[PDB]
Amino acid sequence: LSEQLKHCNGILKELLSKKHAAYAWPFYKPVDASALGAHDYHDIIKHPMDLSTVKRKMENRDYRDAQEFAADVRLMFSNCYKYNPPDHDVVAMARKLQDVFEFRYAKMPD
Numbered sequence: 001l002s003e004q005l006k007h008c009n010g011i012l013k014e015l016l017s018k019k020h021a022a023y024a025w026p027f028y029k030p031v032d033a034s035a036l037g038a039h040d041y042h043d044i045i046k047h048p049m050d051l052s053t054v055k056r057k058m059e060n061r062d063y064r065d066a067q068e069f070a071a072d073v074r075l076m077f078s079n080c081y082k083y084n085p086p087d088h089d090v091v092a093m094a095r096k097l098q099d100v101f102e103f104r105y106a107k108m109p110d
């Protein structure tokens, strides 16, 4: 459980690492809707999430189990799949980052 959360922290660090930066970078910080001209973003996405928030929650010991952590990471991807047309580049980047997440998350210590 402590062990499971360390696995989660390792994943998080990987998702933030240089190795994945080419597709992970849109997920590094909260969506700035005004900056992007996306004035409908917060009407469509009721629960924003991003990797810096996941990181803060982990550093603050907010996550009590792996399932809670996974739910936030997956929310982040779902927000992207909900807001953007499925043929947009940002969606391809999300799918690639999600593949990295899901395959390593699956190796949960038990």
Ligand SMILES: COC(=O)[C@H](C)[C@@H]1N=C(c2ccc(Cl)cc2)c2cc(OC)ccc2-n2c(C)nnc21
Pocket (backbone or CB within 6 Å): 026, 027, 031, 032, 036, 037, 038, 041, 079, 080, 083, 084, 089, 090
């Ligand atoms: C106008 O609509 C947008 O730009 C989306 C809201 C936005 N697209 C993008 C986006 C659009 C095109 C490319 Cl190639 C990459 C990211 C986006 C860009 C960012 O730059 C700091 C941060 C977040 C996003 N992002 C995420 C995550 N989900 N949607 C987006």
Ligand code: NI
Pocket (backbone or CB within 6 Å): 070, 071, 074
């Ligand atoms: Ni889940």
